[PDB]
Design an enzyme around this catalytic site. Structure first.
Site, PDB file in Angstrom:
ATOM      1  N   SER A 107       0.832  -1.194   0.000  1.00 15.51           N
ATOM      2  CA  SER A 107       0.000   0.000   0.000  1.00 15.51           C
ATOM      3  C   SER A 107       0.871   1.250   0.000  1.00 15.51           C
ATOM      4  O   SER A 107       2.021   1.231   0.440  1.00 15.51           O
ATOM      5  CB  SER A 107      -0.922   0.031   1.221  1.00 15.51           C
ATOM      6  N   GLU A 132       8.890  -8.075 -20.935  1.00  7.81           N
ATOM      7  CA  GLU A 132       7.898  -7.696 -21.937  1.00  7.81           C
ATOM      8  C   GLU A 132       6.943  -6.628 -21.421  1.00  7.81           C
ATOM      9  O   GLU A 132       6.453  -5.807 -22.206  1.00  7.81           O
ATOM     10  CB  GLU A 132       7.116  -8.927 -22.400  1.00  7.81           C
TER      11      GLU A 132
END
Ligand SMILES: Nc1nc2c(ncn2[C@@H]2O[C@H](COP(=O)(O)OP(=O)(O)OP(=O)(O)O)[C@@H](O)[C@H]2O)c(=O)[nH]1
Ligand SMILES: Nc1ncnc2c1ncn2[C@@H]1O[C@H](COP(=O)(O)OP(=O)(O)CP(=O)(O)O)[C@@H](O)[C@H]1O
Ligand SMILES: Nc1nc2c(ncn2[C@@H]2O[C@H](COP(=O)(O)OP(=O)(O)O)[C@@H](O)[C@H]2O)c(=O)[nH]1
Ligand SMILES: COc1cccc(-c2cc(NCc3ccc4[nH]ccc4c3)nc(N)n2)c1
Ligand SMILES: [Ca+2]
Ligand SMILES: [Ca+2]
Ligand SMILES: [Ca+2]
Ligand SMILES: [Ca+2]
Ligand SMILES: [Mg+2]
Ligand SMILES: [Mg+2]
Ligand SMILES: [Mg+2]
Lengths: 349, 425, 438, 62
Positions: C140, C254
């Site tokens: 978070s 990628e």
């Protein structure tokens, strides 16, 4: 009860709206940067649209459409009309225009200028910009070269729309004018045309051979009030309402304002706004928008309507603030925040 | 995450006793320390305030302090007298005679080491000590003088632990002696430096609440302590019962205290009791933000909220509280500083207090708390400009500049509250 | 084959990891005891799912995951929950007292004491990898641990794993569920210190998940369990390319190549559809065109913002279920003629598409309905900068008064780090405007 | 509208559709700054304990 904030102190229209909201007994005002508001009467430049709709338990409305600038700046409007299939280059109500930088159209503008030169057709062109207030930075000439150097004389963008050499001239006076129409678009994107427009009229007799005059050709309320001696002869403050202009058309030309002009007005309004509807609509958005526009039109001697420009932060006539501002609150604000006939013509689509 | 409780003096030990009575009932512990409760949620965080002793007995992690044995003998005989660990009673014989100097410098100094010994034995038995809470008054001598002395000593040995207090502020409408403004002013200067959170319980408000709202013609200290124990139960519910709130003393302080010196809170409670009609969520939220429900005699509309925390207890629509909690914001939006966004917190505990289907506890960090310190400062100066009753203190070794210094620090505290009350974005 | 190690930091990271690994086991047919009846490769293998699971000689499939929180109550629930057997004790690391929503306490004071231990336990998993790709870090912005310690860990992973990729899944603070007011400080501080150490970060605004749960699932008052299971579905669709056979997004590299032309501007916007309630006994199943069009409705985005007023730098469409290329292209053709999708001039106007034929999996007894086809769109649009602006404004409001700053200075931090980090955000916000507006 | 690089297997397919072409710090100075923050905590604590020490002195002057 409901809450709102004022962030544009120099707004004539919404100063009356905020004033009328407080008199309701169900609306409370806050400082400029209090975020727990139901309604923002936001600034004109760099309005923080990104900070709207993130306050739990508060439906937030704002008096501006993000992206509407693409219709309200002259250079961007020309781009929108020329590249939008809904409008297309073959657009019958917008004067032949070109955007010229000091992407650019400097050479294509001259290509059509000589095609008219050879054909003896009228070759009056006008240069404009949205940066010059008080009628500063305008030029009307018949020779193209003597204006491009003036465009480059400054360091910002200008446009080259056509000069309508054959306008409709009012009598008595043989004088020019333009029409201002106010359109309100609510959160549902209903298009409301205010029934009351105004003729912003020139008080000097139109003169074709002499464009040297700074006032014989520009009719905006200001350039006639502090640049001309004939301000206020025929009608108060060079402003004629629809009931009179309609009576004049019936008497002088045997036609009505609705038939000869207003149908074209309504077609242009909905055509322009429906073009950008998918780019600015706030239907499924975390905040909602409305905005009141000021469309400026112009009529030629064959009673054809032309669009000249769209103003996103327009002022209203002294003589319709009370009625118009009440209509905004009724349709744009109370529609979203309900309380305890109509002045608008709904343009359906 | 264990808490160590300390109660000092007459007032501190009585409100402390009621506190242990109340939460003991809520956790299902009987006066003998045996558990006879119905739900396992009562025990999941029993360790926060209780040690588990031999025989599956639960013993409060509490230390009882006083310079005279009177109130402590009453406590050992009271309803829940036998639940406290007997070796945690630490008392002297002489007393403090409502004298801050005796509690802080002479009589209290003689006994303070013996108190800290019991603190160490309780702390050594803590898996991970979370902090301390102290109950005491500021108008007397033991809770006021020695209480602040204990705080200074604890911050010495445990400098990285949270120190909070439930401090009863004196008022002429409920007054035992005239030197109360002196003792309070000397104590507050200590609290400004050595506490993380101080809940300002004003006897003026507790009396006005018992008399005006509850319609009690002759309120006793017992009637006022019923309000105090109920509030302290509400304040501690966020740690004592297992919601999906991971609440630690330091985390709560970080969220409520924007500036180190401005850590004096206004407690509040609703409904006010001493009926069976079910109270509505709109009523709970409207009462808990009303001045009549505040434990500090200050008007919240005369200042502005730095932070706020509302605790709801019972089974209610968590949606409805949010709607009403968001609603009240507008009705007092001007009284919340806009430079601390989303500065209002809401917590919900499924377990209600005794004999109430729904309750609400209010904790506000408002600059209007300044009104309280001005009141004490005025009463202080009214006497000090004539050096009245000072001989009681100079006889114990104090110099007059210590009074002048304490006065200036509280006036400084008042001025600090004023700058942020007028501050805008 | 190449392994990926997931790191779950703090309450948000740990609880979201619980939902993700719970869902992974269902998707791969792995039982809570670690057994996988369909796995015939006993004690090993180099299958695609082995990128996230190792194998024991006893046939147990163990997540390549590390859970780390500075207090134990949350990870204790993991050690005693349905998946006790899945993990082994060394993978679950807990402190004694947390960071109290203080970035400084998590990064400096307490972070020093446990950083070496955490990196050690992480290396013990790395030694089991033949060709480690990188790390997926769940945390978070608002928590003191999720913000302060995560940033510290990211710095140390870049030194110990310089040439290895690192992806973030970040929870953006929302007042509707946030029980803290200093989260803007922690968000700015951690983004500044971590920005150069993260290759691609998918940030999820709790506000978006909250409204999605209320609007589309008709849950009057959602809990973290409701939010996390929904988040897990988006995470699963994003990571499915690494766990199943395919040609698109099969290596962490990628993700940066396809979604990130500039390193600093590496926060893609995720949009997911359809979200359908389990209570509705049957819902008219939506077509490929409908769900693909839904990918451009801001009400379905992980972050509330308007792409129409920004520019795209890349876009990937990840379908799961009954989808064929022709139907995708048909939907794209109509969508181009109805939607405001303008790319930057220096990038192609195209969609990289991937399809998994296995339809989405949902937890039994959950709130999500089972659907025949679904899609997650990943788009790097400048419009996401609205979230930075929102956060930066709240930061400016409190820092002008130095509110709460003493809590951080008390833990050893300097005021200069506040302004230093804020200026970094000012540059980032300006970078987004350069690329996004004329 | 051109489709390219179409790869497919038993689990699914992948392809790209184009609608238009275009027009670190070292360890020591990490572990040093952690230590610099630690020494600043120790200085603040020493100042506190010194301040308290001054108070202990005054307590027994009284
Ligand atoms: N989406 C989501 N957010 C969460 C979840 N749990 C915590 N958070 C967020 O995390 C922030 C609070 O900090 P925590 O994550 O609890 O911090 P921590 O890792 O437990 O350690 P601390 O710093 O001591 O709080 C808030 O902004 C929450 O919204 C979760 O399960 N799902
Ligand atoms: N095609 C055209 N032919 C002749 N005159 C024209 C014209 N278009 C505009 N004008 C002149 O310009 C005047 C209005 O100009 P305009 O309204 O664009 O100025 P402006 O842009 O400063 C105010 P706004 O921003 O609200 O539109 C009219 O009175 C008219 O005389
Ligand atoms: N609420 C409450 N306040 C008390 C009680 N006893 C004393 N006080 C307050 O404390 C002040 C007297 O201080 P005292 O209790 O004698 O301090 P001690 O000497 O340390 O015990 C008075 O001004 C009261 O307002 C009590 O039982 N209840
Ligand atoms: C004096 O010793 C104690 C003992 C026990 C509790 C407290 C206490 C309670 C409290 N109320 C509840 C609350 C408030 C803000 C919140 N923010 C996020 C969760 C959250 C919860 N607030 C504070 N500061 N302390 C103090
Ligand atoms: Ca003696
Ligand atoms: Ca001793
Ligand atoms: Ca295998
Ligand atoms: Ca790197
Ligand atoms: Mg203009
Ligand atoms: Mg007494
Ligand atoms: Mg935590």
């Amino acid at each position: 009860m409901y809450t709102f904030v004022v962030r544009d102190e120099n707004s004539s229209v919404y100063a009356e709206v905020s004033r009328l909201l407080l008199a309701t007994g169900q609306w409370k005002r806050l400082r400029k940067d209090n975020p727990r508001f139901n309604l923002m009467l936001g600034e004109r430049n760099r309005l923080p649209f990104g900070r709207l709709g993130h306050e739990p338990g508060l439906v937030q409305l704002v008096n501006y459409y993000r992206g509407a600038d693409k219709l309200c700046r002259k250079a961007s409007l020309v781009k929108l009309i020329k590249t939008s299939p809904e409008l297309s280059e073959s657009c019958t109500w917008f004067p032949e225009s070109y955007v010229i930088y000091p992407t650019d159209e400097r050479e294509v503008f001259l290509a059509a200028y000589n095609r008219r030169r050879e054909g003896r057709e009228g070759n009056v062109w006008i240069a404009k910009s949205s940066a010059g207030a008080k009628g500063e930075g305008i030029l009307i000439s018949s020779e193209a070269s003597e204006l491009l150097d003036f465009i480059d004389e400054q360091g910002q963008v200008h446009v080259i729309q056509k000069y309508l050499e054959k306008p409709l001239l009012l009598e008595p006076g043989h004088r020019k004018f333009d029409i201002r129409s106010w359109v309100l678009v609510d959160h549902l994107y209903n298009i409301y045309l205010y029934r009351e427009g105004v003729l912003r009229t020139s008080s000097e007799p139109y003169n074709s051979a002499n464009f040297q005059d700074k006032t014989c050709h520009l009719t905006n309320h200001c350039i006639q009030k502090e640049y001309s001696k004939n301000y206020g002869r025929y009608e108060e403050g060079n402003e004629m309402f629809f009931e009179e202009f309609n009576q004049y058309l019936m008497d002088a030309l045997n036609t009505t304002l609705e038939n000869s002009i207003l149908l074209q007005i309504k077609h242009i309004i909905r055509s322009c706004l429906m073009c950008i509807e998918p780019a600015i609509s706030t239907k499924h958005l975390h905040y909602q928008s409305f905005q009141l526009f000021g469309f400026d039109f112009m009529v030629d001697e064959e009673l054809k309507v032309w669009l000249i420009e769209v103003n996103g932060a327009p002022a209203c006539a002294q003589k319709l603030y009370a009625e118009l501002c009440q209509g905004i609150v009724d349709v744009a604000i109370s529609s979203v925040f309900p309380l305890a006939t109509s002045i608008f013509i709904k343009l359906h689509h | 995450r264990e808490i160590v409780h300390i109660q000092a003096g007459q007032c501190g030990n009585q409100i402390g006793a009621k506190f242990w009575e109340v939460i003991s009932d809520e956790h299902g512990i009987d006066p003998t320390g045996s558990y006879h409760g119905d739900s396992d949620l009562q025990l999941e965080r029993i360790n926060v305030y209780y040690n588990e002793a031999a025989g599956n007995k639960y013993v409060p992690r509490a230390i009882l302090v006083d310079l005279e044995p009177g109130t402590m003998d009453s406590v050992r005989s009271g309803p829940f007298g036998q639940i406290f660990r007997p070796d945690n009673f630490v008392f002297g014989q002489s007393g403090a005679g409502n004298n801050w100097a005796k509690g802080h410098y002479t009589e209290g100094a003689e006994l303070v080491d013996s108190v800290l010994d019991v603190v160490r034995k309780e702390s050594e038995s803590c898996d991970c000590l979370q902090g301390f809470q102290l109950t005491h008054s500021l108008g007397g001598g033991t809770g006021s003088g020695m209480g602040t002395l204990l705080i200074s000593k604890i911050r010495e040995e445990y400098p990285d632990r949270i120190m909070n207090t439930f401090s009863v502020v004196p008022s002429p409408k409920v007054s035992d002696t005239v030197v109360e403004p002196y003792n309070a002013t000397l104590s507050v200067h200590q609290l400004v430096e050595n506490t993380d959170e101080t809940y300002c319980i004003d006897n003026e408000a507790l009396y006005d609440i018992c008399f005006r709202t509850l319609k009690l013609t002759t309120p006793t200290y017992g009637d006022l302590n019923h309000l105090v124990s109920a509030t302290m139960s509400g304040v501690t519910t966020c740690l004592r019962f297992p919601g999906q709130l991971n609440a630690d003393l330091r985390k709560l302080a970080v969220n409520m205290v924007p500036f180190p010196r401005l850590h004096f809170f206004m407690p509040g409670f609703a409904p006010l009791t001493s009926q069976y009609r079910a109270l509505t969520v709109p009523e709970l939220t409207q009462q808990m933000f009303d001045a009549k429900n505040m434990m500090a005699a200050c008007d919240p509309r005369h200042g502005r909220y730095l932070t706020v925390a509302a605790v709801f207890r019972g089974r209610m629509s968590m949606k409805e509280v949010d709607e009403q909690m968001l609603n009240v914001q507008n009705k007092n939006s001007s009284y919340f500083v806009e430079w601390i966004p989303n500065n209002v917190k809401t917590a919900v505990c499924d377990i209600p207090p005794r004999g109430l289907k729904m309750s609400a506890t209010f904790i506000g960090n408002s600059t209007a708390i300044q009104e309280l310190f001005k009141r004490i400062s005025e009463q202080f100066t009214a006497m000090f400009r004539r050096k009245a009753f000072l001989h009681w203190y100079t006889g114990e070794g104090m110099d007059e500049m210590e009074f002048t210094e304490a006065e200036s620090n509280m006036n400084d505290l008042v001025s600090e509250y004023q700058q942020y009350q007028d501050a805008t974005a | 084959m190449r392994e990926c190690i997931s790191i779950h930091v703090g309450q948000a990271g740990v609880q979201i990891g619980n939902a993700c690994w719970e869902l992974y086991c269902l998707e791969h047919g792995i039982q809570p005891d670690g057994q996988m009846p369909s796995d015939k490769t006993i004690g090993g293998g180099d299958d695609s799912f082995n990128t996230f699971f190792s194998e024991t000689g006893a046939g147990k499939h163990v997540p390549r995951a590390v859970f780390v929180d500075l207090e134990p109550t949350v990870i204790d629930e993991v050690r005693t929950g349905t998946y006790r057997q899945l993990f082994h004790p060394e993978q679950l690391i807990t402190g004694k007292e947390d960071a109290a929503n203080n970035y400084a306490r998590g990064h400096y004071t307490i972070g020093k004491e446990i950083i070496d231990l955490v990196l050690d336990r992480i290396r013990k998993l790395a030694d089991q990898c033949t060709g480690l790709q990188g790390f997926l870090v769940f945390h978070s912005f608002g928590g003191g641990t999720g913000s302060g310690f995560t940033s510290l860990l990211m710095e140390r992973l870049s030194v110990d794993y310089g040439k290895k990729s690192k992806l973030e899944f970040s929870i953006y603070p929302a007042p509707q569920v946030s029980t803290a007011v200093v989260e803007p400080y922690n968000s700015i501080l951690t983004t500044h210190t971590t920005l150069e150490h993260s290759d691609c970060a998918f940030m999820v605004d709790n506000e978006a998940i909250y409204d999605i749960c209320r609007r589309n699932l008709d849950i009057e008052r959602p809990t973290y369990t409701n939010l996390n299971r929904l988040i897990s579905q988006i995470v699963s669709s994003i990571t499915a390319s690494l766990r199943f056979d395919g040609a698109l997004n099969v290596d962490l590299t990628e993700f940066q190549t396809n979604l990130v032309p500039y390193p600093r501007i590496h926060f893609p916007l995720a949009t997911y559809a359809p979200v359908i309630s389990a209570e509705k006994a049957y819902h008219e199943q939506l077509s490929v065109a409908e769900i693909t069009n839904a990918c451009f409705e801001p009400a379905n985005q992980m972050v509330k913002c308007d792409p129409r007023h920004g520019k795209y730098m890349a876009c990937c469409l990840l379908y799961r279920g009954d989808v064929v290329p022709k139907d995708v292209n048909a939907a794209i053709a109509t969508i181009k003629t109805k939607r405001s999708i303008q790319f930057v001039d220096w990038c192609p106007t195209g969609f990289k598409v991937g399809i998994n034929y296995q339809p989405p999996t949902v937890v039994p007894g959950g709130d999500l309905a089972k659907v025949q086809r679904a899609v997650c769109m990943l788009s790097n649009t400048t419009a996401i900068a609205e979230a930075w602006a929102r956060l930066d404004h709240k930061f400016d409001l409190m820092y002008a008064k130095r509110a709460f700053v003493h809590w951080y200075v008390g833990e050893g931090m300097e005021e200069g780090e506040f302004s230093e980090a804020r200026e970094d955000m000012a540059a980032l916000e300006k970078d987004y405007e350069e690329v996004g507006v004329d | 509208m051109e489709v390219i690089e179409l790869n497919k297997c038993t689990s699914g397919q992948s392809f790209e559709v184009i609608l238009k072409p275009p027009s670190d710090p070292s360890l020591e100075e990490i572990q040093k700054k952690l230590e610099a923050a630690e020494e600043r905590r120790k200085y603040q604590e020493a100042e506190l304990l010194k301040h308290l020490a001054e108070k202990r002195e005054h307590e027994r002057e009284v």
